[PDB]
């Protein structure tokens, strides 16, 4: 297959986390398929089809844990596949790929904006909010509540090992929001003063568990301990269809040199191993609501998002498979 | 008062954390009084007395949270004071200071060794142990259990912001113990596989609460959640006598540039504040036992350590005061 | 607009709580709109329409917390509105208002009878039931259980500040049911002997939370502590649509003189403030079942009742707005 | 009136537990109706219909608690009733019973295999699984995990008074799975080493509660204490439709001679009573997932299974009543 | 036999709660013995001793639950009994009663002031404190925190049926402290904004349980839920020695006309009963500290206070029995 | 050394559980040493001393878990030893052994009677008491409550594998107490109707944990869930000294053939292992009180009983060692 350089560049940037955040990654994958379609030099439909299948696999094999990425590839490829099997000519197949990618991308932006609006209504004037990592959907909530005139303060946890809390502190401060930055370890210490916890998600499972940046589950635990609301801001494409049929979500283990830089780690003795899980699992009992672009739900209604938006496709192979 | 340079050097090193760990700091303070006494050029008892009072205040005013430091200054100064008020001549007063310092120091070493022995009996072959920060008393437990032939593995949490888990990982690996190093955020994720949690203390209060490096309380919380034993290794001089009469332990807030280096932090916008608490409070309900050099106790018997070893002195002013 | 006096009297009696109980208020609001339509001297459908809009707003701005009231108003006005925009003439629009009102009222009555029948099957012979405030839905359950020949006793909590428990005690006693009256403070003390807790609702939110008379959340809390079933008897028009899109329910703050009579309160020092919340929020974790006229649900299925019955209207404005 | 011996023999065996297990009992009841219809000497439809009603009542009145039984009877008899009332002739009505009976049995067998496949995806290599009683649905899960090459071990509880763990132990060992057999009392002692709990169900109610062999609720309770996943393997026909309208599930009290054999019990004084409940109720807070043939659900989605699949029948009397 | 009117008047007032509060009642009983001894016309010791026994029994039989009362009586009468039995003459025995009575009263006053001083150190600037009933020991804590210049605010619960919160509110407001008065039912609603709970005690038992005004256990329960410190202010004579040997504390059931006044209650049907428990039991898991005149203790150290101070008397009958 | 046959028979009967119950074993071990001393044909004190040492070791190496046994052995041998090292002659050493044994036995009997009297005061008329295994201390409590005229009923759990519940049921029934026998699995199901749980102990550790018959921790767990008082009746010689210095109590693993008779177990597949723990560990959080012969304590005061009575001996070796 004649795969275009932008597909490989995208895959590499996803892998290395030059591009990151579950939504963003997913939009990047749809964008990559769009560019494979736009630039294909294929002359028959079967040839374009094969490129998009191959491009999809390349993209899918980058980072496993956030289901947004496969859900985006599915969104495009279900549509591409049905056009192809229905006899679509080259330019029709090309345009189905391009347009389906465009749709996912546009709907993703609209979903994140609407999560903002919906979530902002649960934020109250004076609230102190704690967050974790850097989630565009969580930030959309905080930014919108501030734009409505509510005087909020956000506590941002450092989010080791990649220091994602620095991204979030700078972003929220850029909008004029007062920020407090703390190490991850201090989240219990400051939970007494916190009014609301607002975090994102990478995957949400059929039983209502939320998989999100390493450390989410500790914050959610002590929030629950302290009767602080835990709200998860998450697009419908963060919900994980394969978990309806028993699949476990893989926790990505990333390079130990993200924790301890190479120059330092090579001096350490052989009997120290560094483990670097990028995500943990928060059980539904410590989540009060999930805020999707279609509304507020209890975590136990994740199964209904799934049943109604995704369950149909479970009969079939992945749309990129042979 | 003619205070000797070693007293100021000690105080500065305590303040900057060149010297750290609650036990160590306390031994350093006793050592500083010893050196003030050894080198004093005072000619009358009243003059030496005044130097030791002043030296004590200098030492006490360095770091507030670990009560080991004042308990060490008390150990020396109660004895110095009673000698002085009893009519002691210069050389007798000098020697009371020197010998009392020596005693605290020697007893501290013996206490930590014996905590090791006692605590090692609760560690079992095959155990996975999680720890936090760098505590010589906790390390004494782990090292001794390994010396008895038990195959253990220790999970060491990074302990931001000062990276104290690096000290501990290297130390335990140096003794031949297999170590796993994780960021603080991953402590819940790995609590399922952990058999025992072993941590130190800076102060232990009359109601049984343990004050220890920022993050201790999150680990203890999720340990309890998972029915993992939480054991606190702590010398009798980590117990906090003033809490018997209602005193609150001050949580040291340290420089924000320990979290975010100056070069970086000065570029950040004014509306981001960095908060850097060095300690948190773990409630007794999440501690199973405290291991002291006199035995195992439930956290609710802290009041008995206090009543019996320290309560006598509560009638009186601090022995360094006027 | 020529609003008839029954609309003003009804609003006044709601505000003053001369008429109270979430279902009863809702039937009264429907009954007011019915009377506006019956007596209107409008000649034009535009005129009647404008009256019913204004009557609606008058009724809506009485008490904020029980969503039964706006749900009644919507039941009548979604239909009046659809008729008006469809070109209904005067008599058709009038009958639409009058008939929609009567449908609401009749359904409300049936729904309470049916909640009785359903909930009674969960009451067992010999049961001690604790209740709170005065809820016709809850009373329907207890009364029906008694009519079935189950030997029950009901513990009635006083329900300060308005003493709603007195209403309940006398109503149940007049059906022949043995009653124990206690102060609200004694709810924990007698939860040991209690088999079941049966309470009503004013609003039920998307996430499963129940808003009911002040003190409900405490009884639910301690019931849960003691493993005593907490059953909320509540008609589907107690479910709150706007919470689907993130709205917080306003907690009504009533006059301090309802707590401390005027005559006594004026003698009190100025630095005393009396706070009088008429409702609190019981989280879904402390609720076993909601008994609706369509059946038993877990609290987390509240979002389903909302999606099924109310979701469709959230894209539109209020059916009494310009 | 003319009931074949196989109906009576099936009944007698259900009742004596010569045939037991909720699914198996349901299949036997469908079979017994099948055989009645095959062998009926009836000449007219009404006469066949009367036989099938009376047979249904005989089989319904064997054992109360497992809803699988009446659900099987309903499956056959709803379809039989509709053909009788729509005018079917003798052979059409015969065939409808036979074939409906066959469909239930086949669907039961496929549902157990599918539960296996879905549940096995939740089991990981190296897992220690605790189970209780003997459930073909739970065994299907464990069996399949093993066939996938996962190295698992199963802790089988004895399950007094009938010793159903013996069955489970021998069965799992015959497939190749190593087993640890313990008394019921030791379930907490071994919950520390357990990774997963997998049990079956007799009836699952509208609020998410699972009714299963005596002691299930204890294992679920300490599993929750220990953060061990509780998985319930259960077909859709284990869901109890009458609970949607408030029905309490009857817990079967079995003969005390299954606890203490007659010989011994007759020698005991009159003031000892032996109580022998065959089932207990596990509340949904202690269940993480139910694995059905349709997928994984939180227990709070039990109501959705009931609504989609069984609600419709609740207007109508039992399809075997006159 | 010759009992002065002041003993009977003191008794009558204790009983009617014209004099109430556990400490105050104890001081009154000591006073009443004092006055009996002052005014006795007895000529021989035996005759004085008989009067003091009979007076003691009269005062003991007023109100059961607060152990302060019999502890005051014992304080005086142990010392009186020992002087009578050691042969004291009339005036020596008179003086022993008078002076023992004076010592109890003075020690009570000093104990309340010291509790204040110790507890106030637990209150921080800006704290919202919730209290319940009217306790001079808890008020001493709050009063002193305010005198130290801490800006605090107190949430006072109403405390039905006797309205003791009115007393507390007015008293605290007179000292300068701002007060929020709420009904008992609203305690959970406002627990989110509360920093500390400070209540008193009538009896504290050997296992750490605190018996205090009806509703205390509810506030303690939701405080724990919310991680709000529960502090009990209580003198050593609130500790209940008979509980060391297994005695259950009697909970006083007071007249139903304090709940519903006679006028109203006589109009109620016979099948309503009003139950009026004056106290409940808070278990020690819901108490963080007891503040005594001797220091702060965990509630599990109640046994130590009992052992040191009261155990000795448990061999002997009551010092007022024949 | 010439060990008499009663020493060997006693050890054999302990090992086989022909004699069982922690108190009874302890009295039997004392009784054996008594018999060794009575019948010894030693001529020299060195000779008798050596016999009693060897008898002691034989008795100690029977069953490990109940510390009552070594505590009995120590009671006798601390005294025999002190006499020997003090130069006691043959007859003096013999009488020291015989008299120390008789003191142990008499005190044990008194202690159980006294535990009965104390614990009975915590039992109330109408109470349903659940017990587990067969404990003479627990039975002392129930029996005394009945003798006081309290109308109680006792739910007796079967206590597999040895059926110790049958012993209990028949013993209580023969005193006239109504008994309900249930399987261990039914403990949760009947905890609703239970007022109090009364169980014994084999060992109690420094941190407050109770080691008792397998299944104890489960009953305590669910009692705590249901807020049912958990009361452990236990003599001070059930308290375990070595736990003060970090020792873990060994859990006795008994023969698998006690669970599955030999005749049946030999037919079972090789990949089934039967595990038979005779005890489990109940954490102090699930225990309300320990009833000792010296009084009621919270579990966290176990360290006090140990410090008071046993601490002094921990610096010395076992009084039967070389
Ligand atoms: O989609 P949005 O809301 O931006 O992010 C969702 C989540 O994805 C990110 O993962 P990573 O940094 O890519 O590993 C973070 O865990 C974040 O919470
Ligand atoms: O006395 P050891 O057991 O060495 O240490 C006790 C505790 O003191 C240290 O504080 P810091 O690093 O001085 O702030 C850590 O918090 C550690 O756990
Ligand atoms: O609709 P029904 O079941 O009668 O009552 C529902 C609830 O509404 C009432 O409020 P209020 O007395 O109007 O403030 C009470 O809170 C009651 O529980
Ligand atoms: O249908 P399957 O999955 O085989 O079994 C489900 C349940 O039915 C059985 O009841 P019984 O032995 O008939 O009383 C056991 O309780 C078992 O868990
Ligand atoms: O001794 P002080 O601290 O004043 O009061 C302690 C307690 O005694 C009172 O009882 P009552 O009003 O006499 O029934 C209240 O329960 C109060 O909390
Ligand atoms: O000393 P007493 O109160 O009689 O019994 C105490 C405990 O010792 C017994 O063990 P075993 O039957 O010897 O294994 C039972 O566990 C019982 O609860
Ligand atoms: Cl049920
Ligand atoms: Cl009590
Ligand atoms: K908070
Ligand atoms: K673990
Ligand atoms: K109850
Ligand atoms: K486990
Ligand atoms: K709070
Ligand atoms: K109970």
Residue numbers in the entry:
A (entry chain B), B (entry chain B), C (entry chain C), D (entry chain A), E (entry chain A), F (entry chain C): 3 to 324
Anything the authors wrote about it?
In summary, our study demonstrates that PH0208 protein would function as a purine nucleotide dependent R15Pi enzyme and not as a homologue of the regulatory subunit of eIF2B. In NMP degradation pathway, R15Pi catalyzes the conversion of ribose-1,5-bisphosphate (R15P, substrate) into ribulose-1,5-bisphosphate (RuBP, product) in an adenosine 5′-monophosphate (AMP)-dependent manner. AMP acts as an activator of R15Pi and in its absence the enzymatic activity has been found to decline dramatically. Monomer of PH0208 protein consists of an N-terminal α-helical domain (residues 1–122) and a C-terminal α-β-α sandwich domain (residues 123–324).
